[PDB]
Design a protein around this ligand. Structure first.
Ligand SMILES: Nc1nc2c(ncn2[C@@H]2O[C@H](COP(=O)(O)OP(=O)(O)OP(=O)(O)O)[C@@H](O)[C@H]2O)c(=O)[nH]1
Ligand SMILES: Nc1nc2c(ncn2[C@@H]2O[C@H](COP(=O)(O)OP(=O)(O)O)[C@@H](O)[C@H]2O)c(=O)[nH]1
Ligand SMILES: Nc1nc2c(ncn2[C@@H]2O[C@H](COP(=O)(O)OP(=O)(O)O)[C@@H](O)[C@H]2O)c(=O)[nH]1
Lengths: 373, 49, 57, 50, 440, 428, 428
C-alpha cells in the first residue's frame, strides 16, 4: 500500500564498483525493501525501519539504511514523481553581508516557515564569481555598489526545500525594495531586518531556471565554489558540530542565537553530508575512552551535520564551558545556561560538539573546513 | 465499506520486542544520562554496603 | 490485427501484398553490435575508487 | 610516495595514541570535579553497588 | 626495449585482440583515443607500456600488433567502434573475400594477395622494435582464415625470422560442441604444417570456458565478450613479467624452454585462477594456496581435457599481485605431495615460478577485483585423448570423401589429406611414447 | 566490398522478388520513392550488396526483372515498391510464356537472353568484388523454368567462379496448378544438377501449411507466402551485409553445406513464426527458436524430415543473444535426434550469428538443410513424369517447338541418377 | 585456536540460526555489511570461533545452510543480516521437503547430502584445530530431522573426534504444528542417541511460558522466540570466545555434563530475565541469577525438575562477579534441593564464569541441565508414536518413499531403551 520507490546507490568498500539498488518505502507501517537492479533479485525483504522517516526521502539525500549509507539518484517510477515531486522544490538563499551576524534568526525564520535545509556554506564572493551573480541586473547604473556590497563581507548561503518553495519563500522575503517593505509593514524579512534597497536581506531566484542557474553559479557540481572564509589559524579555532538531531528538530537557529549572544563569533559554517569512513576518522580518538561510541558515531553519519568554527573572545567562560558537560542531564544539574544544558538530551543527542582538547581545535577545523572539501 | 476491521495486535516480526526487553532498563537510563542519587545515600553505601 | 485486409470492405483488392508489413511488433531495433557495445564500456560505465579513507592528517 | 603514505599512516597512529591519552586524562579529571561539586550541592553519582 | 609483436588472424583472433587491447589500454592507463591523461603511474612510466604501445611526438600510443582478416566487417567493426583512433589504418589488414571456412582458401589461393602486405607491415613493426622478444599468434583451428593464413604466416615468419619466438594462443576444436563440419579438416591440416614452425602453442578451448563461466562466474546467458575476455586475462598474465617488476622475472623465451621438452610436443594447456564474479569473491579467502589448488582442480582447465587421464610433463605458474614466495613454496609442495597430480618419472623438477608485483586490473565487466592471481600452463599427455578423437573425426569424415572437392578444386592436391593424417598418427605415437615410465 | 546480383524470372519470380525487395527496403530504410530515411548508420554502411549508389541519395536496387509476359511487370511497377527499380531492368517481351519448357529454352527466350545478358553484364562490371548471383523462379511452369535454366547456364559460362543461389518453387502433391509441372520440373532439374551451386527447393503446399497452422491465418495470400520465402531469402544473405560475430556468407555456408557436388538441394526454414495474437505472450528465446526451427512443421518443402536422415544443417541466428544457449541447444537437438542425422559425418551443424535482428523482431534463425528426405520430392515428380511420358502425352508442343524426343529420357535418367546417391547415403 | 562450524537445516533451523548470527554479529561488532565496527579490541579476541575472513577485513560466517525448499533461503538472504554469508554455502535444492523423514533421509534429501558434505569438508579442512559442529534443526518435521540426522551421521563418520552440538526444537505437548511430529521425532532421536555428543532440546511451550511468566509480553512472534534460543547459543560458547577466570569450552562442558554416553539430552536456560516493567524493581546479583536458573518457569524444555532428579547442572556465567558468591550459591542450591539432586555424583554442578557480559546487560548466565526429567518428553513422544503406529497410520508415504517396517520397531525400541536408563538412574 502506497509504495514510494526510488533509485538508490551504494559504494561497496570492498568491491570498488558503484552498486545500484531500488529502494521501496511503505509509509503505512513504515518499512523499507531494496531490490537488486542488475541480477534482478530480492534484497532486504520488507521490514520496519523506523530510523528511516518520510521527510528525509529526497533526491541527493544520503539515507542510512542498515549499515549502508545509500545516496538517492532518481525517481524511477513516476507515481512517486507525480506525488512527492512538486511537493518539494529547490530554492537558493543568499543572506547578504548585512545581517549576516543576524543569520541565526534568519535560519530560525527559515525553519519556522516549514522549510528543510540541505546544504549551508559561508564564503566571500570573488571577482568573476560575484560578477556571475549580476547578469539579471546588468547595464543598469547600480552594478558598482552591488559589487561593493557582495564583496564587502561574508555571505551565508542555503539550499531550501518545500512545496511551492520559490513562491512561498518570496512571500517570506517580501517586496524587493525594503523601503517599500517598511511602508507596507508585513513583517517580512526585509521589513524587520533591512536597511535600504541596495542592502535588503537576501536575494532569491524568481523562476525555476533562475534557481538552477544561480545554484550552479553557487553550490556547484564541479568542486570550486569559494574560499569558504575561515582565517584558518587565528590562535584559537575550536569547532562545533551541530548535529542531525538538532538540524532535524530545527534547533539550529536558536543554537546560533545562543552562540552569538555569548561574546563568541562564528566565522565559518559548512553543512556536509558525511560518510562512515570520515566519521570514523574524526571520532577515532573516541575508541575506548567513552563506553558508548558506535551509537554516537551512527548519529554523526545518520543525517546532515553542520560544522562551524568559533573564535574565542568571551572572557572567563571559554567555549568548552559554554558548551558545558557532555551529558545534558548532568549539564542541567550543573550550570543551567550552557548549550547542552538547554538544548540537548540523551548524551548522544547533544546539540553541540566542542573540541575537547584546548590545544587541538585547529586540527578539527583543518578537517571539516579544509581536508573534507 | 472498505477499511481494516478487527482488533489490532501490535507485534514486530523481526524480533525488536524481545530485543528491547532483553536490554536492562538501568542501561537505557544510563544511555539517556548519568544516574544521580543523594549524597548521604552515596556515603551510606560507601561505608556499610 | 493486420494491415491489408483482403476481406475488408475495399473495392480494389491487389492480391500481391502481404496482409502484414513487418513480422513482429518490437519497438526498439537496437542497431548496435556486441563488439561495438560491450567494447564501449570504457568511455561510459565508469566507477573508480572515489570514496577513500581521508586521513585526519 | 609509497613510503611517504606509510609515514602518514604512522603519524596518524602516533597522534591517535597521544590524543587518546590526553582525552582519557581530561575525562577522568572532569568526572572527579563533577563528583566534587555534586557532593557540594547535595547529590552524587550512582555507581553499581557503590 | 623488451617488446613483443601481437598478431591476430580471423574473426576469432581479431576479437581476441579487441578485448586484449581494451585490457592493455586500461592496464597502462592509455585512453581510447590514443593518448594518456598523465604519467607518473606504475602502469605507464616507460618500461611497462613500451612492451606493447609505441610512442609518437604528439602523445600517440600506437599499437604493436597486426589485425589481419581475409574478410571485412570485423576489421570494420574494430575501426568503427570506440578504438577507431587508437589502431593505425594500415595496422588492421582486411581482405575482400571470406575464406569460406576452407583451409585451401586460407593457404593456397587467396593468401597471396595479402601475405606480402602483411609481411610488409610485420617488417615495419619489427623495424621499430629494439629488442623483439617474439610474436604472439592469436587464431583458431576452425574457420578458414585462422586455419590457413596462419599456416602460411608461420612458414613465412620462419623463413625470414627463423630464430624468433612464436607463442600461439589457439582456439582448439572443442570435444562436443563445435561451430562447423570442416573443423576436423582445418584443424588437422593446420596443425600438420604449423607443428614444425610453431615454437609453443597454448591451446584454450570454448566449452571449457563455457563451463567456467557457467560454474564460477555465475552467468547462465553469456556471449563471446565474456568468453574471450578471460583469454585476454590469460595473455595479460603471460606477457606481463617483462612489463612490470616482481620477485621472479619470467621471460617469453623461458616459456618455450620450460614447457616444450621435445621438438614436436609443444602443446600446453592453459588455466586461470580467480574467475569469481564480484559478488562471490569477497566471502572466500583467495589465498595463494587456494588459488594454486584452483588451477589443479580438474574443472578449472580452460580446455576440456581431464588431467587424471594422463600425466603432466611440465607446469609453469605465473603468480601476480601481492603474492608471497613462501606461500608459493608451501602451495607447490602441497600439490606435489598428493597423488592425483601424477608427474612423469623423467622430470621431478616440473615447475616454473614467475612472480609479478602488479595486481590484476579489473575491466568494466564481470570479473572481480582481486589482488592475487595465477595463470598455470601445463604440458601434459592428456591432450592425446583430444587429438585421437579429432583423428577419429577426420577418419570418419574422410573415409568416403566428404567435402573433399571444395579443397581439391581450390588448389590443394589430394595427397596432403593423407600426409596430415599420418602426421597426426606420428603425433599421437609420440604422445604415447612419452607416457610410460622409464624401465631401462 | 561484396555484393549480390539478384535476378528473378517468371510471374512467380517477379512477385517473389518484389516482396524480397519490399523486405530489404524496409530493413535498410528505403522509402517507396527510393531515398534513405533510416535511424542508424549500421544499415547504410553496407547497402551496396543490393543497392547501387546513384546521385541525390537515390539508392537503386540492382535487380534483373525477367519475364515473357508484360503484365506482371506492370503489376510490379504499380505495386507499393514499384518506383524503386531501374526502368531499364524491366526487360520485357511482347510474347507468351506458353507454359512450355521448350518455349522457354529453344525459342524467343533465346532471342531475349542476349539482352538479359547485356543487362546483367552492365550490372556486373559496375562493381569491385562480386560474390555471385541469386535467381528466383518456379520450376513448375514456363519462363522461370526454361529461360531460367538457359540464363543460369549462360551466366555460369560467362562467370564460372561466382556462387549461384536459386530459389525454385517446386510443384506440390495436393494441388496441380498447371498440367505440365512434370515436364517443366524434370527439364529444369536436368540443368539444375550441373549448374547452380546451392538450390533451396521451396514448395507451395508447405507455405499454406505454415501460414494456416503457425501464423494461424484463415485466408493467407500470395503476399504472405512470398513474405515468408523472402524472409528466408533475406536471412540467408545477412552476415554478408550486417555486422556481427562469427559472420557467414554464401560460399561459407555452401562449403560447409555440400559434402558432394551434386547434393546441393536444400530445404529451408525461418523460425520466429509466432502468431501475432499470441506474440505478446511468447517468451521468445533460443530454445524456442530451436524447437520451432527443428520441428517438422515449419519446413518449406512439402517433404517430411522424419522420412530421411539430415545430411547437413545450417543455423543463421540474428539478434542479441547468448551462444552458450545457441550451441548447447544445438547439441541438445543433435544428441536427442541421433537417428535423424547421418553418422559418417560428425558435428553436422553450422552456427552463424548476426548481431542485428530483422526489424520488428529481436531474435531470429534461418535454417538451410541438406537432407536425404528431399528424395521424396523427386520420387513424386519422377513417377508423375513417367506416368504421362509413357503415353507421349502433352509432348507434341515440346517436340514441335524444336526439341528432340530423347531429351525427356535424358532428363529422367539424370533425375533418378540424382536420386541414387541421396538414397544410398541416407542408409549408409 | 579453535573453531565451530554452524550447520542449519530446515526452515526452523534457518530462521533460528539467522537470528543467532544476528546476535553473534551484534556481540562481536560485525555490521550487516560484514565490516568489523566494534568498540573494544577484545571483541576481536577470538573472532575465528564463528567467522572466517575474506579480503579487506570482511568476516563471513562459517555456516552451512541447507533445506529442500528454496524459499527459506531467499528469506534468510533477504533478512537484515543476510548479505554476510558465503553465497556458495547456500546449498539449496529444487525439490520438496513435505515434512517427511523418509523424503528427507532415504531420497531427494539424500540426493543433496554429497554437496552438503563437500561444503562442510572444505570448511573443516580450512581449519587447524576444529572443536566441532553445531546444527540447528527441528526435531519434528522434515529436512531438519530427515537430512539433519543423516548429516549428523556422515559428519560423525568423517570426524570422530569433535563435539556435535545439536540445537533441536522438540514437539510440544499442548500443540502440534505437524501431525507426523511423533514419527519424525522418534526416527530423529533414534539417530541422535548414537551420533551426536550433546543435544539441546528447546520446547516451544516452555520457550514461551518464559514470555508470559517473566517477560510479560502480549504478542511475541517467532522473531522474539528465537532470540532466547540465540541468547543460549551465545552463552554456551562464551568462554572460548571471551576471556575469563576458570574457562570452559564445549568439550569440557561435555565431559563434565554427560555422565553416560547415551544420556546427553539437555535442557537450556538463560536467566537475567524480567519484564520491561519489572526491570527497574529488580536486584540483579549472582544469588537472584542462580535462583532464576533453578526456578521451573525459565527453562526452555517442558520437563519439570520436580518430576526427576538432576544428574548434572552446568552454569556458565558472563559478567564481572565474585567467585565465593557463585560457589556458595550453587552449593546452597544443592543443599536446599537435596532430594532432587543425585547422590552418586557429589557436586553434580559444573560452574564457569566469563568476564564481559552481553551488551545491554550487566551480568548474564546460561544454564545447562541433564536430569531424569527428559523421560517425560521421550515417553510422551513414545506414547504418541505407539498411538499412531498400532493402526499403521500416516505410514504408507514412508513405505512408498523407501522405508521398511522393522526399523520403525527399532526406533521405538531405542526410544524405550533410552527411557529405561533415565528411569533406572532416577532410583539408582
Ligand atoms: N571471444 C570470441 N571467440 C570467438 C569469436 N568468434 C569465434 N570464436 C571462436 O573461433 C572459432 C571460429 O572462428 P574463426 O576461425 O575465426 O572463423 P573464420 O576464421 O573467420 O572463418 P570464416 O569466416 O567462416 O571463413 C569458433 O569455433 C569460436 O570458438 C568471437 O567472436 N569472440
Ligand atoms: N510464393 C509465391 N508463389 C507464387 C507466386 N506467384 C505464383 N506462385 C506459384 O507459381 C505457380 C505457377 O507459376 P508459373 O506458371 O510457373 O509462372 P510462369 O512460369 O511465369 O508462367 C503457382 O502454383 C503459384 O502457386 C508468389 O507471388 N509467391
Ligand atoms: N524457535 C523457533 N522455532 C521455529 C521457528 N520457525 C519454526 N519453528 C518450529 O519448527 C517446527 C516445524 O519445523 P519444520 O516443519 O520441521 O521445518 P522444515 O524442516 O523446513 O520442514 C514448528 O513446530 C515450529 O515451532 C523460529 O523462527 N523459531
Amino acid at each position: 500500500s502506497e509504495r514510494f520507490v526510488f533509485i538508490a546507490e551504494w559504494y561497496d568498500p570492498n568491491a570498488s564498483l558503484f552498486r545500484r539498488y531500488e529502494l521501496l518505502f511503505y509509509p503505512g507501517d513504515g518499512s523499507v525493501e531494496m531490490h537488486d537492479v542488475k541480477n534482478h533479485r530480492t534484497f532486504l525483504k520488507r521490514t520496519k525501519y523506523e530510523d528511516l522517516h518520510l521527510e528525509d526521502l529526497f533526491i541527493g539525500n544520503k539515507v542510512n539504511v542498515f549499515s549502508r549509507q545509500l545516496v538517492l539518484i532518481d525517481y524511477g517510477d513516476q507515481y512517486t514523481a507525480r506525488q512527492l515531486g512538486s511537493k518539494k522544490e529547490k530554492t537558493l538563499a543568499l543572506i547578504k553581508p548585512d545581517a549576516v551576524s543576524k543569520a541565526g534568526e534568519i535560519i530560525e525564520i527559515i525553519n519556522k516557515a516549514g522549510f528543510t535545509l540541505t546544504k549551508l556554506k559561508m564564503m566571500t564572493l570573488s571577482r568573476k564569481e560575484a560578477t556571475d551573480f549580476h547578469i539579471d541586473h546588468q547595464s543598469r547604473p547600480f552594478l558598482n555598489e552591488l559589487i561593493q556590497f557582495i564583496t564587502s563581507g561574508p555571505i551565508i548561503a542555503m539550499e531550501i526545500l518545500r512545496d511551492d518553495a520559490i513562491c512561498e519563500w518570496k512571500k517570506l522575503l517580501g517586496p524587493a525594495n525594503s523601503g517599500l517593505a517598511r511602508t507596507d509593514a508585513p513583517g517580512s524579512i526585509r521589513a524587520v531586518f533591512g536597511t535600504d534597497g541596495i542592502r535588503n536581506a537576501a536575494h532569491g531566484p524568481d523562476s525555476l531556471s533562475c534557481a538552477a542557474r544561480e545554484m550552479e553559479l553557487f553550490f556547484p557540481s564541479s568542486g570550486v565554489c569559494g574560499p569558504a572564509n575561515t582565517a584558518k589559524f587565528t590562535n584559537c579555532t575550536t569547532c562545533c558540530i551541530v548535529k542531525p538531531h538538532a538540524i532535524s528538530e530545527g534547533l539550529l537557529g536558536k543554537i546560533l542565537m545562543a552562540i552569538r549572544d555569548a561574546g563568541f563569533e562564528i566565522s565559518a559554517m559548512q553543512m556536509f553530508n558525511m560518510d562512515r569512513v570520515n566519521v570514523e576518522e574524526f571520532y577515532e580518538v573516541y575508541k575506548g575512552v567513552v563506553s558508548e561510541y558506535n551509537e554516537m558515531v551512527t548519529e554523526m553519519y545518520s543525517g546532515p551535520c553542520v560544522a562551524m568554527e568559533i573564535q574565542q573572545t568571551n572572557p572567563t567562560m571559554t567555549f568548552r564551558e559554554f558548551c558545558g558537560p557532555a551529558d545534558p542531564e548532568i549539564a542541567r544539574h550543573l550550570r543551567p545556561g550552557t548549550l547542552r544544558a538547554i538544548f540537548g538530551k540523551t548524551k548522544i543527542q547533544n546539540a553541540v560538539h566542542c573540541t575537547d582538547l584546548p590545544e587541538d581545535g585547529l586540527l578539527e577545523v583543518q578537517y571539516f573546513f579544509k581536508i573534507l572539501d | 465499506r472498505f477499511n481494516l476491521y478487527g482488533v489490532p495486535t501490535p507485534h514486530t516480526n523481526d524480533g525488536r520486542n524481545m530485543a528491547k526487553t532483553l536490554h536492562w532498563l538501568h542501561e537505557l537510563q544510563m544511555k539517556r544520562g548519568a544516574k544521580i542519587e543523594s549524597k548521604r545515600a552515596d556515603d551510606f553505601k560507601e561505608k556499610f554496603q | 490485427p493486420k494491415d491489408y485486409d483482403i476481406e475488408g470492405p475495399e473495392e480494389v483488392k491487389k492480391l500481391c501484398n502481404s496482409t502484414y508489413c513487418r513480422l513482429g511488433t518490437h519497438e526498439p531495433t537496437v542497431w548496435k553490435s556486441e563488439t561495438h557495445e560491450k567494447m564501449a564500456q570504457v568511455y561510459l560505465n565508469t566507477e573508480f575508487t572515489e570514496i577513500k579513507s581521508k586521513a585526519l592528517l | 610516495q609509497n613510503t611517504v603514505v606509510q609515514e602518514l599512516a604512522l603519524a596518524n597512529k602516533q597522534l591517535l595514541m597521544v590524543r587518546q591519552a590526553a582525552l582519557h586524562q581530561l575525562f577522568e579529571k572532569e568526572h572527579r570535579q563533577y563528583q566534587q561539586e555534586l557532593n557540594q550541592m547535595g547529590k552524587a553519582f550512582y555507581v553499581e553497588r557503590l | 626495449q623488451r617488446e613483443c609483436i601481437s598478431v591476430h588472424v580471423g574473426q576469432a583472433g581479431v576479437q581476441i585482440g579487441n578485448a586484449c587491447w581494451e585490457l592493455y589500454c586500461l592496464e597502462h592507463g592509455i585512453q581510447p583515443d590514443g593518448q594518456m591523461p598523465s604519467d607518473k603511474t606504475i602502469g605507464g612510466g616507460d618500461d611497462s607500456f613500451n612492451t606493447f604501445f609505441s610512442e609518437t611526438g604528439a602523445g600517440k600510443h600506437v599499437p604493436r600488433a597486426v589485425f589481419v582478416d581475409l574478410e571485412p566487417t570485423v576489421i570494420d567493426e574494430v575501426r568503427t567502434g570506440t578504438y577507431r583512433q587508437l589502431f593505425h589504418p594500415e595496422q588492421l589488414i582486411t581482405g575482400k573475400e571470406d575464406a569460406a571456412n576452407n583451409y585451401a582458401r586460407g593457404h593456397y589461393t587467396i593468401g597471396k594477395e595479402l601475405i606480402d602486405l602483411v609481411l610488409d607491415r610485420i617488417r615495419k613493426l619489427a623495424d621499430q622494435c629494439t629488442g623483439l622478444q617474439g610474436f604472439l599468434i592469436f587464431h583458431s583451428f576452425g574457420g578458414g582464415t585462422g586455419s590457413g593464413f596462419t599456416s602460411l604466416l608461420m612458414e613465412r615468419l620462419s623463413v625470414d625470422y627463423g630464430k624468433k619466438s612464436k607463442l600461439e594462443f589457439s582456439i582448439y576444436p572443442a570435444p562436443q560442441v563445435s561451430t562447423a563440419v570442416v573443423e576436423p579438416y582445418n584443424s588437422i591440416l593446420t596443425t600438420h604444417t604449423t607443428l614444425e614452425h610453431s615454437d609453443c602453442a597454448f591451446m584454450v578451448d570454448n566449452e571449457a570456458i563455457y563451463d567456467i563461466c557457467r560454474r564460477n562466474l555465475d552467468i547462465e546467458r553469456p556471449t563471446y565478450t565474456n568468453l574471450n575476455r578471460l583469454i585476454s586475462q590469460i595473455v595479460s598474465s603471460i606477457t606481463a613479467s617483462l612489463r612490470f617488476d616482481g620477485a621472479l622475472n619470467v621471460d617469453l623465451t623461458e616459456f618455450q624452454t620450460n614447457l616444450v621438452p621435445y621438438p614436436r610436443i609443444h602443446f600446453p594447456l592453459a588455466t586461470y585462477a580467480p574467475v569469481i564474479s564480484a559478488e562471490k569473491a569477497y566471502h572466500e579467502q583467495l589465498s595463494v594456496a587456494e588459488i594454486t589448488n584452483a588451477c589443479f582442480e580438474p574443472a578449472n582447465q580452460m580446455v576440456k581435457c581431464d588431467p587424471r587421464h594422463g600425466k603432466y610433463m611440465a607446469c609453469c605458474l605465473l603468480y601476480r599481485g601481492d603474492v608471497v614466495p613462501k606461500d608459493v613454496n608451501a602451495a607447490i609442495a602441497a600439490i606435489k605431495t598428493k597423488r592425483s597430480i601424477q608427474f612423469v618419472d623423467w622430470c621431478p623438477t616440473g615447475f616454473k615460478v614467475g612472480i609479478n608485483y602488479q595486481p590484476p586490473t579489473v575491466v568494466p565487466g564481470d570479473l572481480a577485483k582481486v589482488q592475487r592471481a595465477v595463470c598455470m600452463l601445463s604440458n601434459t599427455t592428456a591432450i592425446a585423448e583430444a587429438w585421437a578423437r579429432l583423428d577419429h573425426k577426420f577418419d570418419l569424415m574422410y573415409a568416403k570423401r566428404a567435402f573433399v572437392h571444395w579443397y581439391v578444386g581450390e588448389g590443394m592436391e589430394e595427397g596432403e589429406f593423407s600426409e596430415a593424417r599420418e602426421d597426426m598418427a606420428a603425433l599421437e605415437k609420440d604422445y604415447e611414447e612419452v607416457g610410460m615410465d622409464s624401465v631401462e | 566490398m561484396r555484393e549480390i546480383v539478384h535476378l528473378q524470372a517468371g510471374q512467380c519470380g517477379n512477385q517473389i522478388g518484389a516482396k524480397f525487395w519490399e523486405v530489404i527496403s524496409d530493413e535498410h530504410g528505403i522509402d517507396p520513392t527510393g531515398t534513405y530515411h533510416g535511424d542508424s548508420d549500421l544499415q547504410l554502411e553496407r547497402i551496396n550488396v543490393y543497392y547501387n549508389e546513384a546521385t541525390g541519395g537515390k539508392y537503386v536496387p540492382r535487380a534483373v526483372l525477367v519475364d515473357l509476359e508484360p503484365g506482371t511487370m506492370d503489376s510490379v511497377r504499380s505495386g507499393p515498391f514499384g518506383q524503386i527499380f531501374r526502368p531499364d531492368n524491366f526487360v520485357f517481351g511482347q510474347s507468351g510464356a506458353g507454359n512450355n519448357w521448350a518455349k522457354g529454352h529453344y525459342t524467343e527466350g533465346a532471342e531475349l537472353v542476349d539482352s538479359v545478358l547485356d543487362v546483367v553484364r552492365k550490372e556486373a562490371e559496375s562493381c569491385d568484388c562480386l560474390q555471385g548471383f541469386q535467381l528466383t523462379h518456379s520450376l513448375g511452369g514456363g519462363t522461370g523454368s526454361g529461360m531460367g535454366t538457359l540464363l543460369i547456364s549462360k551466366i555460369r559460362e560467362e562467370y564460372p567462379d561466382r556462387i549461384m543461389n536459386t530459389f525454385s518453387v517446386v510443384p506440390s502433391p495436393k494441388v496441380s496448378d498447371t498440367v505440365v509441372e512434370p515436364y517443366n520440373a524434370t527439364l529444369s532439374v536436368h540443368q539444375l544438377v550441373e549448374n547452380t551451386d546451392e538450390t533451396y527447393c521451396i514448395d507451395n503446399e508447405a507455405l499454406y501449411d505454415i501460414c494456416f497452422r503457425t501464423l494461424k491465418l484463415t485466408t493467407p495470400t500470395y503476399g504472405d507466402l512470398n513474405h515468408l520465402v523472402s524472409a528466408t531469402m533475406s536471412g540467408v544473405t545477412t552476415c554478408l551485409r550486417f555486422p556481427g560475430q562469427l559472420n557467414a556468407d554464401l560460399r561459407k555456408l555452401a562449403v560447409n553445406m555440400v559434402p558432394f557436388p551434386r547434393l546441393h538441394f536444400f530445404m529451408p526454414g525461418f523460425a520466429p513464426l509466432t502468431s501475432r495474437g499470441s506474440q505478446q505472450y511468447r517468451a521468445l528465446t533460443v530454445p524456442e527458436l530451436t524447437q520451432q526451427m527443428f520441428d517438422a512443421k515449419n519446413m518449406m518443402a512439402a517433404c517430411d524430415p522424419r522420412h530421411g536422415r539430415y545430411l547437413t544443417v545450417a543455423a543463421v541466428f540474428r539478434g542479441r543473444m547468448s551462444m552458450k544457449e545457441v550451441d548447447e541447444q544445438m547439441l541438445n537437438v543433435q544428441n536427442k535426434n541421433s537417428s535423424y542425422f547421418v553418422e559418417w559425418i560428425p558435428n553436422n551443424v553450422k552456427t552463424a550469428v548476426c548481431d542485428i535482428p530483422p526489424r520488428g523482431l529481436k531474435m531470429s534463425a534461418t535454417f538451410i538443410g541438406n537432407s536425404t528426405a528431399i528424395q521424396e520430392l523427386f520420387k513424386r515428380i519422377s513417377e508423375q513424369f513417367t506416368a504421362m511420358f509413357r503415353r507421349k502425352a502433352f509432348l507434341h508442343w515440346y517436340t514441335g517447338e524444336g526439341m528432340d524426343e530423347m531429351e525427356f529420357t535424358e532428363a529422367e535418367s539424370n533425375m533418378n541418377d540424382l536420386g541414387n546417391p541421396v538414397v544410398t547415403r541416407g542408409a549408409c
